Amino acid sequence: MLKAWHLPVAPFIKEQQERLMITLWLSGDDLPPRVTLRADNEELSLPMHRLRQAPHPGVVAWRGEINLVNGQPRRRYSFKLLWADRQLWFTPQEFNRFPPARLEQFAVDLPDSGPQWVADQVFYQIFPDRFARSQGSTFYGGDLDGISEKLPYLKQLGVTALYLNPVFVAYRRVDPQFGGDAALLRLRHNTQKEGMRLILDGSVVRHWLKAPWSMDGWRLIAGITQAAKLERPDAFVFGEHFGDARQWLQADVEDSAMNYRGFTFPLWGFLANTDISYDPQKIDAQTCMAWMDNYRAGLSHQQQLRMFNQLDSHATARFKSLLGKDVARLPLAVVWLFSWPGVPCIYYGDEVGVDKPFPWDPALQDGDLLDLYKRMSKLRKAHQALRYGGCQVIYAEDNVVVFVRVYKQQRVLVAINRGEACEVVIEDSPLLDVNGWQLKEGAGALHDGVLTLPAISASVWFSR
Amino acid sequence: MLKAWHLPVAPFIKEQQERLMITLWLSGDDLPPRVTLRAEEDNEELSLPMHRLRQAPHPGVVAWRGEINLVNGQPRRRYSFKLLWADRQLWFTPQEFNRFPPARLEQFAVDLPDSGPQWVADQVFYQIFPDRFARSFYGGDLDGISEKLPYLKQLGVTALYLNPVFVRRVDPQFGGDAALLRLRHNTQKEGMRLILDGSVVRHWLKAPWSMDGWRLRHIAGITQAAKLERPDAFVFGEHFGDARQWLQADVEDSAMNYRGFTFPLWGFLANTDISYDPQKIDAQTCMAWMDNYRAGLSHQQQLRMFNQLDSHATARFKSLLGKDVARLPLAVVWLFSWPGVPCIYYGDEVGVDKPFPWDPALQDGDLLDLYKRMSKLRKAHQALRYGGCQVIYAEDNVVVFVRVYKQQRVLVAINRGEACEVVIEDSPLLDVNGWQLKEGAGALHDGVLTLPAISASVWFSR
């Protein structure tokens, strides 16, 4: 049977001078004697050649290249496999018998003018009134100076970036109940001292990106983003879209979006049987991964890496409550939040099991859930594949999802099981052709092509 | 098994004051107790409750109705259907059922109000390369085109597309600007539209030129300027690839529908593509391809898509068919029946595969009659101009779809191979008084379609 592999990341792509080297892996019995790379402002049919060296047993590699001197920075491409009498397309969504949509090709941004720092962050979203008062009707009285005082707690959590929502009285002034502008200036100063980024909910845009405010970005069209980039070239401008944000992302009017359609609601469906309307969902692993892969396909690799992933937000119920009787699935969602492409965003209180003022008393905190959050941010800070890697789903059937993050030689294997304990046969795969695997999270077992997965579990292996 | 029908056209939609009434048809054994109309989308996704009607519109069909308030929101009304059971949900979309939510830009869509060029759907276009058409360099000129306007009227043409015309200045080898002005006056007297290939945008839509449109953010400014001078200007682009991003942002009115019509027919009928790479496309894949493209377009946009078998940038379709040239009348029936406006490339109607053959002894007379017959059928039946389109059957060699408009139905059957017979499922879209065959030699009889070899047949509901 014909198989193919390509991820818009090393080892499948490589820049060399002004040339983007692209590699396709194939396997099967009736291999195409020709493959063309379908890719300067016009659609081109670029020739590929077959390499002499098999990259993996039973795999032939084809290589082509795009000239980067001329063209828009977003490099779109797909693979046109050619036989004597027919053709087949390879895309981010497997094979296609008819041409893929232009906006559903593989894509890499070269050169990349997006905010390079976002992929390295772990964001924390704060509703200031309920987080921390600095040492009422519905004003609990927490403020920004409370946040400053809690910067050590968040540093220990793995947090590197704060997202404040709300901030302003809604030209633009910080709410006096949060400490006013003077408290915000202190919070900027203190997060800089801790190496933490700071993002505010919203030329007003340029003013708060100016010194001495020097905010790292805005949560909000293209004119706003362009003005934001003029004041601060690495400003992060992202949108809160509950629906399909792809049209905005595909026109580059925002750097990223809070990825409800591409991450949150698929997991609400697969893990909590519900959706944004609290209508019932009966979503198996096949459908969840088709959904998530279909959304991703419209995004360049760099865009995917900046997508804002969250289990819940100021606008939704807490995910822990949404799981209801199936609250044991919550750690599965935490592993997933930190291992899927994009930047994890923790809604304040999720890490201590809130389901309402933050419980600073350690006896009202779920310490095991808190430990898991610390472990995932550590694994993510230590392994480039969880921050910069491509993502390929290996297995999606009923209760079990298995995908691998791919970056240079590094592989991170993730196995998610929402149901009873089981064993799952994983076909031999050249993406999984490694020395061995080190189990670093979870209690699953990988041995002789077989995954042994405990009931209601998530497991992470790293290639050695 | 669950079945569903909806086309963004009457009898499924109907405007009433400032409300858009939407109807969904369902059929099957485990029907959803609830259905939600998921609408608006562009600003504020809304969940609108639908209720069930007491009258079955067709045997075995339950109807659900909801409504969108048209007072607020952008003119493009996007929606889809969220079928609800106690434990699960299912989406109904232009591409049938989906287990997860459809893309926002792949929902049903109607333009209300429709500010696009409403006259475009009523046209039959004729694209001329002026040097090879008619002398009054082979030496053809625009005054030659004027002299041949009776011939083009007899063909059924109602709109001319000149490519090229300019050197900007009208090329002097064609008669210069004066010959084009006479062609504008002569085509206006014949009621024919005139589109030129391209600030200069406004100059040619202004008097005394008063052209009907142009062939081309940068495009958005060009389109914005054309509409300011002439609100019914037709601004469309020549896209060989996927034009959806430009159309879904309204920077152009329409596109030369290579991705959505031409190349699917090249694959299915002529086994080739724009690169002349081999194509092995059966009816299932061709119809999935063509329907996948349309789903990214509103109904009004689809009716304006520029359909073509070939053009100045391509080989003639008659030659691309090669040994399979008997399929050419199939493509002509399809050109005039698929959603969009047909564009005839000069000489296709007389079998050009090079100066135009004006000697009736060098013309394919039978192919000419078919063009005449199809343009008369299109001009006489609104469903072929304003109707929705539902693929009924698409397997291997046979394509069968229906155009739907109010009570009118047009059934089209295409068979690229040997004579065969086909079973057509009962469909509430084909539940009609009876069928009148008006083109082709197919036969419909008690659920059986008998399709002659390499043929296309058109029936009309009576």
Q: Is the link from the previous residue into A266 a cis peptide, with omega within 30 of 0?
A: no
* Residue A392 to residue A389: CA distance in whole angstroms: 10
Query: At the top level of CATH, which class does the domain B120-380 belong to?
Result: alpha beta
Q: Report whether CATH 2.60.40.1180 matches the domain A389-463.
A: yes
Which residues make beta-bridge pairs with A393?
A403
Is the CB of residue A296 less than 8 Å away from at least one CB of chain B?
no
Rg (CA), chain B: 23
Decide if B456 contacts B412 (C-beta within 8 A): yes
Residue B64 has which token pair? 């659900």
Resolution in A: 2.4
Question: How far A134 CA sits from the closest chain B CA (Å)?
Answer: 38
CA distance A334 to B149: 72
Architecture of domain B386-461: Sandwich (2.60)
Ranges of CATH 2.60.40.1180 domains, chain A: 389-463
Strands (E) in A269-333, as ranges, are 308-309
Give the C-alpha distances (Å, rounded to integers) separating B169 from B161, B174, B397, B410: 17, 11, 49, 45
Of B240, B245, B280, Cβ closest to residue A86: B280
Q: Which residue has the tokens 């082979």?
A: B138
A95 has a chain B CB within 8 A of its CB? no
Amino acid at B272: T
Tokens of A398: 């009923």
What contacts B48, CB < 8 A, 6 or more positions away?
B36, B37, B38, B39, B66, B67, B68
Tokens representing A342 are 């994009």
CA distance A326 to A455: 12
The whole-angstrom distance between B382's CA and the closest CA on chain A is 31
The Cα of A167 is separated from the nearest Cα of chain B by a number of Å equal to 24
Pairing mode, strands B51-52 and B13-16: unpaired
Q: How big is the CA angle at A191 (ends A185 and A196), to the nearest 5 degrees?
A: 140
* SS3 (DSSP) at A398: coil
B86 touches A at CB < 8 Å: yes
| B 250-269: CB under 8 A from A | 259, 263-264, 267
Helix H or strand E segment including A165: none
Match domain B2-111 to its CATH number in 3.40.50.300, 3.30.70.20, 2.60.40.10, 3.90.470.20.
2.60.40.10
* Distance separating alpha carbons of residues A419 and A417, to the nearest angstrom: 6
> Pick from A244, A287, A288: which is nearest to B103 by CB?
A244
Closest residue to B277, CB basis, from A43, A87, A250 = A87
CB contact under 8 A, B85 and A242: no
- How are strands ordered across the β-sheet holding B234-237? B254-255, B234-237, B213-215, B193-197, B159-162, B125-128, B341-345, B306-307
Strands (E), A371-409: 390-397, 400-407
- For chain B, give every residue range classified as CATH 2.60.40.1180: 386-461
Phi, psi of A105 (to 5 degrees): -90, 175
Which of B41, B241, B281 has the CB atom closest to A43's CB atom? B241
What dihedral do alpha carbons A107, A110, A114, A116 form, nearest 10°?
110
Per the CB < 8 A criterion, the answer to whether B101 and B133 are in contact is no
Question: In the CATH scheme, what is the code of domain A3-109?
Answer: 2.60.40.10
Q: How many CA atoms lie within 13 A of B426 on its CB side?
A: 8
Residues of chain A with CATH 2.60.40.10: 3-109
> Number of Cβ pairs closer than 8 Å across A and B?
101
Residue of chain A whose Cα is closest to the Cα of B259: A99
Q: Where do you find CATH 2.60.40.10 in chain B?
A: 2-111
* B208 Cα distance to chain centroid: 31
Cβ of B421: how many Cβ atoms within 10 Å? 11
Sign of torsion over alpha carbons B183, B118, B404, B261: positive
| B275 contacts A45? CB cut-off 8 A | yes
Of B45, B263, B278, the CB nearest to A85: B278
Closest CA to A376 of A324, A338, A418: A338
Pick A244's closest partner by Cβ from B47, B82, B104: B104
In this complex, is the C-beta atom of A97 within 8 Å of any C-beta atom belonging to chain B? yes
Q: Is some CB atom of chain B closer than 8 A to the CB atom of A277?
A: yes
Q: For residues B250 and B236, what is the distance between their CA atoms, to the nearest angstrom?
A: 10
- Is residue B264 within 8 A of residue B290, CB to CB? The reply is yes
Q: Is B74 on the interface with A (CB under 8 A)?
A: no
Tokens at residue A144, please? 């920004």
Residue B42 has, within 13 A of its CA and on its CB side, a CA count of 11
Sign of the alpha-carbon torsion through A228, A232, A233, A238: negative
Q: How was this structure determined?
A: X-ray
| Closest chain A residue to B275, measured at CA | A45
User: Cβ of A97 and B285 within 8 Å?
Assistant: yes
B328 to chain A nearest CA, in Å?
Answer: 21
Instruction: Judge residue A428's burial from the number of C-beta atoms within 10 Å of its C-beta, 0-12 exposed, 13-18 middle, 19 or more buried.
Output: exposed
In the CATH hierarchy, which fold is given to the domain comprising A118-382?
Answer: TIM Barrel (3.20.20)
Strand ranges (E), B112-192: 125-128, 159-162
